[PDB]
Amino acid sequence: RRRKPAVERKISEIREEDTRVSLIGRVIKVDKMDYMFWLDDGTGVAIIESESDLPKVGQVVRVIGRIIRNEEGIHIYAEVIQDFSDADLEALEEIRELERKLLPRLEGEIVW
Amino acid sequence: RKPAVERKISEIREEDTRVSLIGRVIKVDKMDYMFWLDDGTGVAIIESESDLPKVGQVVRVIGRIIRNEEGIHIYAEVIQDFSDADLEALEEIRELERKLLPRLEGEIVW
Amino acid sequence: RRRKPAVERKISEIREEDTRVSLIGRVIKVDKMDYMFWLDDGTGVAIIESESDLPKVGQVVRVIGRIIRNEEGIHIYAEVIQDFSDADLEALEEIRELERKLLPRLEGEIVW
Amino acid sequence: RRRKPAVERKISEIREEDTRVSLIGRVIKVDKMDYMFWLDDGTGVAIIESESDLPKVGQVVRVIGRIIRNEEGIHIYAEVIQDFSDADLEALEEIRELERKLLPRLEGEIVW
Amino acid sequence: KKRMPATRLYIKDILEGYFVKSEGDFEPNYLITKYARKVYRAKIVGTVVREPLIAEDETYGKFQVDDGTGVIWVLGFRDDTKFAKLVRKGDLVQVIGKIAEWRDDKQILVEGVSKVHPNMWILHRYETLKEKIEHIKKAKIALEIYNQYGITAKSKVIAKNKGIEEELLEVIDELYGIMM
Amino acid sequence: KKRMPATRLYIKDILEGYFVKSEGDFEPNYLITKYARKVYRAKIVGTVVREPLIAEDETYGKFQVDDGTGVIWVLGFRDDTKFAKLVRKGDLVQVIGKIAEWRDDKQILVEGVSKVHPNMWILHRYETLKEKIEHIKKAKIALEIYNQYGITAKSKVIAKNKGIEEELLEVIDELYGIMM
Amino acid sequence: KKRMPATRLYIKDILEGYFVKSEGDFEPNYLITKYARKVYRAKIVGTVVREPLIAEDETYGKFQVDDGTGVIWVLGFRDDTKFAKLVRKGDLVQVIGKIAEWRDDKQILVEGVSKVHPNMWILHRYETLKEKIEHIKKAKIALEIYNQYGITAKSKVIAKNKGIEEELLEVIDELYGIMM
Amino acid sequence: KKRMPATRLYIKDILEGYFVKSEGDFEPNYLITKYARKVYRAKIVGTVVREPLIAEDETYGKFQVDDGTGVIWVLGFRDDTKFAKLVRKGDLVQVIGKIAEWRDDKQILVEGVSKVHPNMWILHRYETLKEKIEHIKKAKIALEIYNQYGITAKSKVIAKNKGIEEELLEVIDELYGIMM
Amino acid sequence: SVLTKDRIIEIIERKTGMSREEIEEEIRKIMEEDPYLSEQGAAALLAERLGIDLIEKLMRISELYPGMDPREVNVVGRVLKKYPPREYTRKDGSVGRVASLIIYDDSGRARVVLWDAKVSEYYNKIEVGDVIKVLDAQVKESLSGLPELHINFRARIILNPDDPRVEMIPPLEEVRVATYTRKKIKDIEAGDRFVEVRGTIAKVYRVLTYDACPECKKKVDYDEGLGVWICPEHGEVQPIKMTILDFGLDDGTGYIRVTLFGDDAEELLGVSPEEIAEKIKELEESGLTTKEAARKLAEDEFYNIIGREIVVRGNVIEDRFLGLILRASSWEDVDYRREIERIKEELEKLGVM
Amino acid sequence: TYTRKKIKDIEAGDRFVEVRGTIAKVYRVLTYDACPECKKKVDYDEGLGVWICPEHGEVQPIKMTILDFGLDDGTGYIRVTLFGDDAEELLGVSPEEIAEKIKELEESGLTTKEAARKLAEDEFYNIIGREIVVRGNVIEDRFLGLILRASSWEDVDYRREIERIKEELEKLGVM
Amino acid sequence: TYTRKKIKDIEAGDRFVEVRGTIAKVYRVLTYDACPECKKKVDYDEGLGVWICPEHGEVQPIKMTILDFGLDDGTGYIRVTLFGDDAEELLGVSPEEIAEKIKELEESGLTTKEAARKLAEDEFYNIIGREIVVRGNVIEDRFLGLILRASSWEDVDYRREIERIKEELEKLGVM
Amino acid sequence: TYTRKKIKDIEAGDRFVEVRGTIAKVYRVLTYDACPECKKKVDYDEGLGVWICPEHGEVQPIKMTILDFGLDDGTGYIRVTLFGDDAEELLGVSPEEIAEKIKELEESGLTTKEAARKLAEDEFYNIIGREIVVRGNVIEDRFLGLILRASSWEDVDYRREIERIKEELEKLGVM
Ligand SMILES: [Zn+2]
Ligand SMILES: [Zn+2]
Ligand SMILES: [Zn+2]
Ligand SMILES: [Zn+2]
C-alpha cells in the first residue's frame, strides 16, 4: 500500500473522509506547555500539535500533518512545518480555483 | 515394536504376525531355500533366505507368516539350535505361565 | 598434534617462536577492498587479515589469529573477532601483570 | 593496493614470497579428528587443514588457501575446496605450458 | 551526441503511465502517459516527507517526494548518493532525473536535486498545467486523423498539412498496440 | 534493434583498460583495452572467493570473482540483486554483464550468472587465448598502416584490400588521443 | 562403600514403571514398579533381534534385547562401546546394567553382556517368578499396614513385629505421592 | 539430599589433576588437584574456538572451550545434547558442569552454558586468582601439621583450633596415597 | 475544539463589558489591517490584545492513578533503568516490538512501556540519565500495584524539554535505596532478613502460573459450589494469572533455593504469563499431572538461563520438607566494578600486595 | 546433416545449421494447445465449442511449450525459439505447470503477452549463462529479423571444440 | 537590445539572446591569467619570457575563471560558457582558492583537462537543478555544436514569468 | 564337605562354603613368583640374590596368577579372590601371556597397581555376566570388609538348581 498523497484544503472546508491535510495560514498564539498552537486561515481557527519545533506569532506558514477525530474535537497532528511569509497567496488561490475547475474534464476526453 | 510371540503348529492363529516355532527338520529343498519342520503334531513350511538346517535335529525359528493364496509359508528370519536341550520343562513352565500370569497383574491396584 | 592454547601477548613483545596469538586493541585504519585492518594498541601498529567480516574504526576489539611470518613483514591470520567496546582495560592490564608476577612462584611452593 | 590473485604454482616449486596459492591434486590420507588431510600431486606431499569439511579419500580436488609458515612445518590452510573428479589434467597442464611460454613475449608487442 | 530535454509532469501522471523498456543498447527506457506524451527525463518540484535513508557504506540513498498528488521514491545509486546527502526532511526541493521500474512502482533515478523558493513551485504548477492542456488538444486533433487511416503516406502528408508533428502518430500507434 | 555481442576476456585486461563514458543518450559507455579492442559486454569464468553480501532490504547484491589473474567486484542493483542469490562460496561460475566505473576501480554489472563444470573452465581458457592472439595479430598489422599514413580515404582502401577492418583504425586513433 | 545387589525383572515391568530421578550427589536414580518395588540395576536374559549398530568414531553403541515380553534398547557410551562389539545377531545372551529414562522411554545402560545356554533361560523364568510371587505377597501384606495408620511409630513397630521391612512403607508412600 | 558447591578453576589445573573414581554407587567421582583441592563441579569461562559438532541422531553434542591456558572438551550426552546448540564459534561463554575422564584426558560434561560480557571474564580472572592464593596458603599451613603429627585426634583438634578445616587432612592423606 | 466566534464575543463581553456592536466595530478594525485573518481569528487577536485570550487555562508521578484522561498527563523524569526491547504477539497474530524503560523524579518512580514503531523513534535516541517530557499518554496499573505508562500512537515523547521541573529532578548519583546485607551462602540461617547473594543459576526446579487477586496481588481461592474466585480481602474478584519460579543459586561455598514471584520472574524469563498458561494447559491435555507438567516445562524449554550470574536479595525461611529457601523481593544484574573492588580489598586483606 | 557455422555468416534462407553459444536473455515463455497425435496446432471453434485439427478432425487438445530466448557466441546475437518437449526439458518443469502459471497470471488482471514476459523473467531467470549447442533452420521475420527455429538441442561436446580450437591455433601460426 | 528566444529556435549566428532554463550538467571549471583592466588573455611570450597584452603593453596579469555547463528548458539542450567574475558570483568563491585546488589536484598526476573536469564533477555538483537566466551571444563550434557565451547572468524573475504565462494562456483561449 | 549358603547370611570366619552367582565386575589380575612344591610365594633375599622358600630351602620360583572380581546372587555383593590354575581354567590364558602383557604395560611408565587395573578392564571385561559357582572361605580385611577366598570353582549345575527351585517353591505354598 503506497502512502496516500497530501490534499490541500481550508479549515472551513475540511472533509470527514480525509486523513492527511496541508494547511496554509497564520498562527495567532501558541501554548508551549502542550507544544501546540492556534492557526488561522482567514476562514477559521485550528489546533495544530507541534512535535519538536515551535513557530512564532505572526508568520504565514504551511503545515502538512495528520487529522485525528475524537469526542474532544478537531486537533491536527503536525508533521512538517515550513515558512511561507515571504511569499504570494493571491496567485496560489487563483491557481487553486483554476486547477479545481479544470481537472474534472481534462481526463474526460481522449479515450485510451 | 511388536514383542516376539511363540506358538504351536496346530494352534497357530490368523491374528499372529511374528511367531516363534520349535520343531525338527524332516526334509529340505535347495531350489527354493525352503524346508519342513515337525514338532510331533504337524508340518510347517519354512522359507529360509540363505541358510539351510539339517534333517533330524530340534531347532527354534523366529519368523513371520505369509498369509497368501499360494499356500502356507513362514518368512523366517532367525534360526537357533537346541540339539543339546530339553523340552518337557519348557512346556511345563509355559503351562505355568499361562495359568498364572494373566491373573497376577489383575491383582492389587496402583 | 595437541592443540596449543592461544597465548596472549602485547604487540611489541611478539616473539619469533610464537604461533597462535590473541591481540586486543583498537582499529585506527581499515580497508574493505583488501579486507585488512590495522590495530593500534599504543605500543605499535599491526596488520590483521580478516576473512568474512570487518570491524569499524575506533571501536575496541579483540582478535585471535595465527602468525604469518615472511620477509614482507609481520601479519596475523585472524580467525576469531569479538568486540570489547565497553570494557575496563585498566583492570585487565593490572590483572595481567599481577598474574605474571605471581603464578611462576606459586607452583614453586609445596612438594609432590 | 589491489589484492593479489591466487597464483597457480606447483608444490615442488613453492616460492618463499607467495602468500596465497592454489593446488590441484589427490588426497591420500585423511584425519578427521584433527581436520587434516594430505595432498599429493605426484611431485610432493603437503598437509592441508580445514574449516569444517573434509573430503573422502581418493578423488582429485583443488584447494585455494594461504600458506602458513612456521617452525612446525610448511602446510596450507584451506579456504576453498572444489571437486575436479571429472577434470582432464593433461589439457590443463598443456595450456599452462603454452601460457608461460607465450604470454611474456605477447605483451612485448605494440608500442606505447 | 544529443540530449533530450526534461519534461515537467504531475506525479500522478508518472505513477500510472505505461513503461516501455528498451531492448537494444542504442535507445533508452521511457514512459508514455495516458494522453500520449513521450517522457524521457522528469523534473518535479515538491516537498520531502521523510528522513533520507542512506546505507552506511554510501552505496545507495533513497527518499520520498510528494507534490500533493502522489508519492515517489527518489533513488540515487553508487556515487549518486552525494545528491541524497543534500536533503533534510522538511524542505521544498526541485528534482530532475530519469524514470525506471522496480516491483511495479515508478521510481526516479536521480540526476540532480536542489533547494528552491515557493515561487518556483507556483511556476511549476503553471507550466505543467499549460503543457498538459496543449498536449491534450494536440492529441485530440490527431486522434481522428489516426483513426480514419492510421499510418499511411497520405495520412502522414495530411497530418503535416494540419501541422501535427510526425511523432504523435506512432506514439498513438504504440499506445493502441499496448491496449491489446 | 541491435545488441552488440559480448567478448570473452581475462579479468586483468578488464582492470587495465581505458574507460570512456558516453555523453549522449544513444551512446553506451565502453572500455578500450590496451591493445585496441572495444568491449561493451564482458563474459568471464571464475571461482567465487567470498560469500555474497546481500542487502536485507533486497536492494543491492555483490560478490568477488577470481580466475587466476585478478579479482573483481561483481555487482547487482535494484531488481538484479536476485542474481546475487544464486551463488555461494567455493562455486565455479560464469558471469556475463556490462562494465561500470566507481572509485577508480572497474566493476561488472551483472546480467547473467550460472554455474558450470571444469571442462567449461578449460575451454574458456583456450577460447580466450585464441581470441586474444587473433586480435593482437590484427592490431600489429594495423598499427603501421595507421602511423605511417594516417587517416585518409586511400588508407581505408588499403585497409580493405589487405583485409584490415575500418573500425580498428579509429579505435587506435582514439586510443592514442587518450594516451597523449 | 556399598553396592546394592542387582534384581531380575520382566521387560514389561521396566517399560511400565516409574522413573524416580534423584537430584542429590549422594543418591542415585532408581525405578519403582507398579507393585511397589525399588530397582537399581536391571539384569535380564534374552535374545537380540537386530544387528548391532556402532558409531564410526567409537562414541556410542546400542542394540535391541528381546525375550518375548518386550524389546529394550541397551546402550553404552564412550568406552562401554566395546560391549556392543562382543555380541552378534541371533544369539541368546544375558545383560546386566543400569536404568535411565530417555525421551519418555525406559533404557538400560549396559555394564556386562555374555553368551549363555537356554537351560539358564528356563532357570531365569523360574527365578523371576519366584521373586515376583514373594514381592507381590509382601506388597499385599504391607498395603493394609500402610493404609490403616500411615507413617507412625506404632505402624512400623507392628509391621516389623509382623515380618515386613520398614522401607516398604516409604516405598508405598513414594508411589502414592507419584500417583497424585 | 545435598549437592556440593562448584569451584572456579583454571584449565591447567583440570588437565593436571588426579582423577579418583568412586566404586560405591552412593559417592560421586572426583578429582584432587596438584595443590590438594577436591573438586566435584567445575565452573570455567572460555571462548569457543571451533564450530559445534552435532550428531545426526543427536545422541551427543560437543565443542571446545579455551580461556587462555589450555583447550578442553565440553560434551553432552543423550538428553543434554540440546546444550550443544546454544553456542556458536566466536563467543565468550561460561560453563558450569561436572568432570569426566576418557582415554587419559579430562573432559567436562555440561550442566549449564551461558553467554556473558567481557566484564564477566575479568571478574573470573580476579576471583579464580584469589581462590587459588587462599587455597595455597591453607595448604602450606596444614602440610606441616600433617607431616610432623599425622592423623590423630589431638592433631585434628589442633588443626581445628589453628584455623585448618577437618577434611583437608584426609585430603592430604589421599593425595599422598595416590602420588605413591 | 477552539472556541467559536460567537463564544469569544460572549467571553469578551463578560470580561470587559463592551457591547456586541462595539466589539464588532473593533473586529472590523482588525481585518482592515490584516484581511487574511478570520472573523474568529480577529476575535482571538482582540482578546489577546485585551488580555482575555488565556481561556485555555506542576504535576508529579505520585498523584497519578489509572483512569486519567491522557490530556492531563504532563510529567517529567530522569532515566533510572533501561531495559532491552522485547517482542510480543499482537491480537491479530502479528508480532510486535515492545520495550520498557524506568524513569524517576523527586516525587517517585514509574515504569514506562514503549510500543510498536515508536521504539525506533525514541528508544534509540534515549539514554540513561536523560530527561523525558510525557504528554497525551495512557496510565495502566502494574502487577506490583504501581502505575505503568503505555506509549501508544497518540502518546508523545520529547527529548530535553524546556520545563522548569527538569532542574528539580535529583541526579542518578544522588539516588538512594535500601541497604539490605551482603553475606556468603555458607553462613546464613533461617529467619535472616534483607540478605543479598551474588552467584550463578545452577538448577531450574519449577515454573508455575496461577490465579490471584488483581488488587492486593495475592492468590484467590475458587469456590466450586459458587463458581467464582473469592478473595477474603475484597470479596469476589476477577482472577489474574501470575507466575512463580523456583531455581537454585550457587556461589562456590554453597547452594541454595530461591523463589521469584510475578513481574521479576516475567522479566527474567522474558515471556508474558499467558503463554505459560496455555503451555501448562496443553501439557495437561496430554494426561500428565500438574506438578509433573510444571517440572517438564521447567526442564524442556527454559533451560537456557542456567549459568548466568545474578544478584538476588530477600528473606530466607525454612521448610521441614525442603530445607532452606530464599523468598526474593527483587533481583538485579551485576555491576562489576564494585565486585572488582571487593576482590581487590580481599586480596589486600590476604596480604599479597 | 547439420553444418556448423559462425553466427556472423547466418543469412535468411539457410537450412540445417548448428550454432554453439550462451543464453544471454529470455524473451518469452508460454504454452498452447495442439493435436495429441501429430503435435500440430489445432483451432478451437467458439460456435462449435470443439477443437478442430485439419488432419485428424476433432481431437483433445494437449499443452505444448513455446520458448523464445537469445543466443550469443562472441560474434553476434540471434533470437532462438524452442517448441514443445525440448523446451520444458531445458526448463525442467511439466508443461501443465506453465499453463497453470500463465493462467494464474491471467486472473490477476493482466493480459497474455505481458503475463508471459513476467513469467519468463521472474521464475526462469536461472537459465541465463548456460552453454548450449542448437540445430535448426533460419527464418526471416519482417518484425524481428533473423530467427533460429531449433529442432533439438544438446549439451556441448568438449573434445570436439578443444580439437577445433587446436586446429585454429595451428592454422593461425602458433601450433 | 536583448531578445527572448526559445531554445528550439536557436540557430548559429544569433546575437544578443537571453534564455531561461535549468542547469542540467556541469562539464568543466578552470581559471587562468589575463589582463586585469581589459579582461583579455595575455601571452606568456618566451622570447622575452613575460606576460604581454599586445593591445596595452606589458601588464601584470590576474586570475579569472571559466565555467562550462549545460542548460535545459523543456524544449532543447544547449551548452553555456560563463566568463570571469560572473562565475565567481554564481559559485560564491574566490578564483584564487579554485586555483590552488586545481594545482593540488593536478600535482597528483592528472592532466589539466582531466583535473579540471574532476574538480567540476566532485565539488560543484550542488548547483545543478536550479533555475537560471542566461544572457549572451551564440557561437558555433565544429566539434561541439552550439555554445552560448554568457555576457551576464541573473536569477529567474517571478512576476514577469507569471504575467507572460498568463497572457500565453489568454492567447490559448482558456480565459 | 562344602555347605551351601546364601550371601545375605554370609559371615566372616566361615569355611567350606559354596555359593552360586554371577560375575559383575573384575577387580585385579596379577602374577607373581611362588614355590613349585607348596605353591607358596618365595622370599627373594637381596643379601643372597635368590628366592628362598623357608619350607623347602632354595627353590626356583615359578609364576602363579591371582584374580580378584565381584559376585552377585541377587541378595548381596561379594568380592572374591581366586588362585592359580583355577583362574587358568576360568580365563583360558597361560600365565606367561599375562606376564608379558603386564610387563608391556609397565615399560610405558606405569607401576603395578594401575597397570594391572588397566589390563583387567581392557582385555578381561568379557567374563562378567557369566554364572559361576564358587567354593571357599570367608575372610575379613580392615579396608575391603568381606572377601571370599575360593579354593576352587565349578560350572553351574542346572538340574540341581532347578529341583532346588521346585522344592523351595513347594515349601512356599504354590503347588
Ligand atoms: Zn484481593
Ligand atoms: Zn492432428
Ligand atoms: Zn590589456
Ligand atoms: Zn615351598
Residue numbers in the entry:
A (entry chain F), C (entry chain C), D (entry chain I): 6 to 117
B (entry chain L): 8 to 117
E (entry chain E), F (entry chain H), G (entry chain K), H (entry chain B): 2 to 181
I (entry chain A): 2 to 58, 63 to 358
J (entry chain G), K (entry chain D), L (entry chain J): 184 to 358
Q: Could you share sentences copied from the article?
A:
Replication Protein A (RPA) is a heterotrimeric single stranded DNA-binding protein with essential roles in DNA replication, recombination and repair. In Archaea, the same function is also fulfilled by a heterotrimeric RPA. We report three crystal structures and five cryo-EM structures of Pyrococcus abyssi RPA (hereafter referred to PabRPA), in its apo form as well as bound to ssDNA. We find that archaeal and eukaryotic RPAs share a conserved heterotrimerization core, which is composed of three OB domains connected through a three-helix bundle formed by a C-terminal α-helix from each subunit.
Unexpectedly, aside from forming nucleoprotein filaments in the presence of ssDNA, we discovered that PabRPA oligomerizes in solution to form higher-order assemblies in the absence of ssDNA. At micromolar protein concentration range, PabRPA exists predominantly in the tetrameric form, as shown by SEC-SLS. The PabRPA tetrameric supercomplex is formed by two dimers (AB and CD) arranged in a C2-symmetrical assembly, which interact through contacts involving their Tri-Cs. Interactions within the AB and CD dimers involve their OB-3 domains, while the two dimers are held together by interactions involving their OB-4 domains. An interaction between AROD and OB-4 was also observed by Cryo-EM. By isolating a subset of the dataset through 3D classification, we determined an asymmetric 3.8 Å cryo-EM structure of the PabRPA tetrameric supercomplex showing the interaction between the OB-1 domain from one RPA complex and the OB-4 domain of another RPA. Instead, AROD participates in RPA-RPA inter-molecular protein-protein interactions.
